Design a protein around this motif. Structure first.
Motif, PDB file in Angstrom:
ATOM      1  N   UNK C  56       0.837  -1.191   0.000  1.00 57.77           N
ATOM      2  CA  UNK C  56       0.000   0.000   0.000  1.00 57.77           C
ATOM      3  C   UNK C  56       0.875   1.244   0.000  1.00 57.77           C
ATOM      4  N   UNK C  57       0.418   2.275  -0.706  1.00 57.32           N
ATOM      5  CA  UNK C  57       1.108   3.554  -0.778  1.00 57.32           C
ATOM      6  C   UNK C  57       0.081   4.669  -0.871  1.00 57.32           C
ATOM      7  N   UNK C  58       0.405   5.814  -0.278  1.00 66.16           N
ATOM      8  CA  UNK C  58      -0.434   6.997  -0.366  1.00 66.16           C
ATOM      9  C   UNK C  58       0.437   8.226  -0.181  1.00 66.16           C
ATOM     10  N   UNK C  59       0.330   9.170  -1.108  1.00 72.02           N
ATOM     11  CA  UNK C  59       1.107  10.389  -1.024  1.00 72.02           C
ATOM     12  C   UNK C  59       0.375  11.591  -1.578  1.00 72.02           C
ATOM     13  N   UNK C  60       0.366  12.693  -0.834  1.00 69.89           N
ATOM     14  CA  UNK C  60      -0.354  13.890  -1.233  1.00 69.89           C
ATOM     15  C   UNK C  60       0.473  15.128  -0.925  1.00 69.89           C
ATOM     16  N   UNK C  61       0.130  16.218  -1.605  1.00 66.49           N
ATOM     17  CA  UNK C  61       0.738  17.516  -1.372  1.00 66.49           C
ATOM     18  C   UNK C  61      -0.316  18.581  -1.617  1.00 66.49           C
ATOM     19  N   UNK C  62      -0.117  19.749  -1.015  1.00 64.96           N
ATOM     20  CA  UNK C  62      -1.082  20.828  -1.140  1.00 64.96           C
ATOM     21  C   UNK C  62      -0.388  22.159  -0.908  1.00 64.96           C
ATOM     22  N   UNK C  63      -1.034  23.229  -1.361  1.00 61.92           N
ATOM     23  CA  UNK C  63      -0.574  24.587  -1.117  1.00 61.92           C
ATOM     24  C   UNK C  63      -1.750  25.533  -1.280  1.00 61.92           C
ATOM     25  N   UNK C  64      -1.638  26.706  -0.667  1.00 56.43           N
ATOM     26  CA  UNK C  64      -2.706  27.691  -0.710  1.00 56.43           C
ATOM     27  C   UNK C  64      -2.117  29.063  -0.433  1.00 56.43           C
ATOM     28  N   UNK C  65      -2.660  30.087  -1.086  1.00 55.93           N
ATOM     29  CA  UNK C  65      -2.191  31.449  -0.869  1.00 55.93           C
ATOM     30  C   UNK C  65      -3.279  32.434  -1.261  1.00 55.93           C
ATOM     31  N   UNK C  66      -3.424  33.494  -0.473  1.00 58.49           N
ATOM     32  CA  UNK C  66      -4.386  34.543  -0.764  1.00 58.49           C
ATOM     33  C   UNK C  66      -3.939  35.831  -0.095  1.00 58.49           C
ATOM     34  N   UNK C  67      -4.442  36.954  -0.600  1.00 63.26           N
ATOM     35  CA  UNK C  67      -4.222  38.243   0.038  1.00 63.26           C
ATOM     36  C   UNK C  67      -5.315  39.205  -0.395  1.00 63.26           C
ATOM     37  N   UNK C  68      -5.432  40.303   0.342  1.00 61.21           N
ATOM     38  CA  UNK C  68      -6.376  41.350  -0.007  1.00 61.21           C
ATOM     39  C   UNK C  68      -5.943  42.640   0.665  1.00 61.21           C
ATOM     40  N   UNK C  69      -6.217  43.762   0.010  1.00 62.32           N
ATOM     41  CA  UNK C  69      -6.037  45.077   0.606  1.00 62.32           C
ATOM     42  C   UNK C  69      -7.237  45.928   0.228  1.00 62.32           C
ATOM     43  N   UNK C  70      -7.667  46.780   1.151  1.00 63.35           N
ATOM     44  CA  UNK C  70      -8.797  47.666   0.922  1.00 63.35           C
ATOM     45  C   UNK C  70      -8.479  49.025   1.517  1.00 63.35           C
ATOM     46  N   UNK C  71      -8.752  50.079   0.763  1.00 67.85           N
ATOM     47  CA  UNK C  71      -8.487  51.422   1.239  1.00 67.85           C
ATOM     48  C   UNK C  71      -8.385  52.381   0.069  1.00 67.85           C
TER      49      UNK C  71
ATOM     50  N   UNK E  34       6.921  18.337  -4.568  1.00 61.26           N
ATOM     51  CA  UNK E  34       5.489  18.058  -4.583  1.00 61.26           C
ATOM     52  C   UNK E  34       5.185  16.792  -5.371  1.00 61.26           C
ATOM     53  N   UNK E  35       5.865  16.596  -6.498  1.00 58.29           N
ATOM     54  CA  UNK E  35       5.672  15.385  -7.285  1.00 58.29           C
ATOM     55  C   UNK E  35       6.377  14.181  -6.673  1.00 58.29           C
ATOM     56  N   UNK E  36       7.360  14.406  -5.798  1.00 54.12           N
ATOM     57  CA  UNK E  36       8.046  13.290  -5.155  1.00 54.12           C
ATOM     58  C   UNK E  36       7.114  12.526  -4.228  1.00 54.12           C
ATOM     59  N   UNK E  37       6.112  13.205  -3.671  1.00 49.38           N
ATOM     60  CA  UNK E  37       5.170  12.551  -2.775  1.00 49.38           C
ATOM     61  C   UNK E  37       4.149  11.700  -3.514  1.00 49.38           C
ATOM     62  N   UNK E  38       4.053  11.825  -4.836  1.00 50.09           N
ATOM     63  CA  UNK E  38       3.055  11.101  -5.611  1.00 50.09           C
ATOM     64  C   UNK E  38       3.535   9.738  -6.087  1.00 50.09           C
ATOM     65  N   UNK E  39       4.820   9.432  -5.942  1.00 47.89           N
ATOM     66  CA  UNK E  39       5.371   8.170  -6.396  1.00 47.89           C
ATOM     67  C   UNK E  39       5.952   7.392  -5.224  1.00 47.89           C
ATOM     68  N   UNK E  40       5.881   6.064  -5.259  1.00 50.34           N
ATOM     69  CA  UNK E  40       6.296   5.275  -4.094  1.00 50.34           C
ATOM     70  C   UNK E  40       7.803   5.121  -3.973  1.00 50.34           C
ATOM     71  N   UNK E  41       8.502   5.101  -5.098  1.00 49.13           N
ATOM     72  CA  UNK E  41       9.928   4.857  -5.082  1.00 49.13           C
ATOM     73  C   UNK E  41      10.273   3.412  -5.374  1.00 49.13           C
ATOM     74  N   UNK E  42      11.580   3.141  -5.354  1.00 48.91           N
ATOM     75  CA  UNK E  42      12.079   1.824  -5.738  1.00 48.91           C
ATOM     76  C   UNK E  42      11.554   0.735  -4.814  1.00 48.91           C
TER      77      UNK E  42
END
Lengths: 106, 66, 155, 103, 51, 52, 103, 51, 60
Positions: C56-71, E34-42
């Motif tokens: 079994x294998x599972x791998x994920x990644x994520x990112x997020x960014x936002x900003x705002x200015x008012x005046x 980021x793409x390194x986390x998507x593959x299991x490796x050898x």
């Protein structure tokens, strides 16, 4: 756009409610050996939904050739008889020359 | 030198087993269209050129490189 | 020339990616019995086996960014370009009780984008540089310092 | 006897960006297409963020208010990121990178 | 994306569907750690190809 | 210890290009104020068409 | 194996001022813009507060009742603060400043 | 996909159904470690062909 | 499209409400030994639903 060219810019979405202005297509035929400063006739035909062009005045319009360059500027007073097509006797003033092969060869 | 000052030098994969793509690869970069030759209207006395005319009513679909 | 800029910026960006792999095997056979006795291959081998795998294998990644200015910020034209575009620049300082805050904006705009009340949106400003910050001991509380910066860049 | 096998795989990816960026024409192509490029920097309290966009567009895709959608930009390069200690918190560093590439 | 299309399939707003593209090659992926986390490796690849 | 180089604001690789100044017409040569590079069409929408 | 990472950063800033301040023209520019400057002091019971504003404005932005909004002032410098022992309570002093700049 | 079709079966929008394709060969599959998880391997294949 | 060729581009979905324009098919017969610069007759026939082409002007 024409009013912006003179310093009057209406806010976006403003309806001019104009009733004395009509959009037209201006056509001129440039005679051979036409020199800058000469005047040629122009035919003015309405392309929108104006009922009549009688008594109108053509504003500054640039006349383009088949290569996309401006060769004349047309103004003047329309003479209409079909009320949507009028003619101007010296509407377009030639501003550029087109070269000629007349003097070449034997 | 071969490095431009404005753009700069544009120049563990063995443990990865994959090679990442690079942005700007010539194999995927767009091709700028060839510039058409000038008409030389003095030869015919006319502004008509088969390669330069624009039809007023065409929809302007893509038809050439670029 | 004085031009008023309405600061209205709102950017938001998200990204996500994940992958899964799974594999399993389960093969089991009881010893074969024919004729009332247990069949033997060779001298000591039965007709039986037992296999059990689970990968079994599972791998994920994520990112997020936002900003705002008012005046609001009012700037002035510092240069006129060849096509009529206007390079603008200006700053604005406010000391409310204690501590000074500043707003700084520079960029290039079209006169066509200036509305009727001499106001232009901040998203219409080309080469925009917007800075809204403080100064002094008030700004000292907003940064961690060397100690946390080293820990954050090491881990 | 009893034999059994089961094997599956999956993947997923998505992204989105929302905002505005004003750029300028840096080159005009032979067919009239415009190569555009520009950057935008914002320092809100602490830390600088930037937006960078480059690409090629058709004048036909520019709407009436001089605005063009970002999906109409050919050879698009969109970059929205930060800078400094704020961006240092977004990356794991060498230690986790080695562990992630080894396992 | 790469492929071959008919001008007849280009709609009025200069847009064409991706299912109208012949010899289509569509690639949507990442790059870096980021793409390194998507593959299991050898290690997991060997286990998955052996079992 | 970072492994990355941060961008700098004002990089010439991303800075805008100020448009070239058009040459003067010199109307004394033709007696006319018409210049192909300087005329402005009253009805054009003014889309972007040049550097800057 | 199990590897995991998470990193975030944030910032926020806001301000507001409400009131009135009457200033005077100190210089007239070449285009007719007016450089303005003025101060206003109020001693209510104990302690003096001041409001100070300087900047440049357009005569076109001055409304009918001879009033102009503060967001129409170019190169604005707005200062609203106190003075004396009342203002001494608003600052931490050397002791907390050193601790805040060291940590 | 490969096969032979009639021009009469091509609809107005230049689209033809897949059941109208003669000698059809349709293949939809993956490649790489993703496809390695879809097959059992030698061990289970021998057990499945023996029992 | 013709208006776009002159610098006027209406927003998408805008109805021109034109009443003085008709779409036509133009046909000419090119005589033998026709040289550039010569002029030939053209027949203009309406292909839409215009009631009359009388008094019109054929555009380029």
């Amino acid at each position: 756009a024409m009013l912006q060219n003179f310093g009057i810019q209406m806010p976006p979405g403003t309806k001019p409610k104009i009733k004395n202005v009509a959009a037209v297509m201006v056509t001129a035929e440039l005679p051979p050996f036409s020199k800058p400063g000469q005047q040629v006739d122009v035919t003015v035909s309405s392309i929108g939904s104006a009922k009549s062009l009688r008594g109108g005045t053509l504003l500054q319009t640039f006349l383009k050739g088949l290569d996309g360059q401006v060769y004349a500027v047309a103004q003047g007073n329309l003479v209409v008889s079909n009320p949507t097509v009028g003619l101007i006797s010296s509407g377009a003033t030639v501003e550029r020359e087109i070269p000629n092969p007349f003097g070449r060869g034997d | 030198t071969v490095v431009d000052a404005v753009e700069g030098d544009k120049s563990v994969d063995t443990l990865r087993g994959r090679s990442d793509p690079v942005a700007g690869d010539p194999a995927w970069a767009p091709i700028h269209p060839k510039k058409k030759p000038e008409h030389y209207a003095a030869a015919t006395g006319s502004l008509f050129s088969a390669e330069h005319i624009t039809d007023l009513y065409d929809d302007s679909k893509p038809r050439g490189i670029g | 020339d004085i031009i008023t800029v309405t600061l209205d910026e709102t950017t938001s960006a998200t990204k996500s990616a994940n992958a899964d792999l799974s594999k399993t095997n389960e093969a089991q056979m009881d010893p074969l019995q024919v004729g009332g006795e247990e069949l033997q291959i060779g001298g000591k081998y039965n007709f039986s086996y037992d296999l059990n795998n689970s990968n079994s294998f599972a791998g994920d990644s994520s990112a997020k960014q936002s900003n705002s200015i008012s005046g609001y910020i009012t700037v002035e034209v510092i240069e006129v370009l060849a096509n009529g575009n206007l390079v603008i620049r200006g700053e604005k300082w406010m000391t409310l009780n204690t501590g000074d805050e500043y707003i700084r904006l520079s960029g290039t705009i079209r006169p066509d984008d200036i509305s009727f009340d001499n106001t232009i949106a901040s998203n219409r400003v080309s080469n925009a540089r917007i800075q809204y910050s403080g100064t002094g001991v008030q700004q000292d509380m907003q940064e961690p310092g060397f100690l946390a910066r080293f820990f954050n860049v090491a881990l």
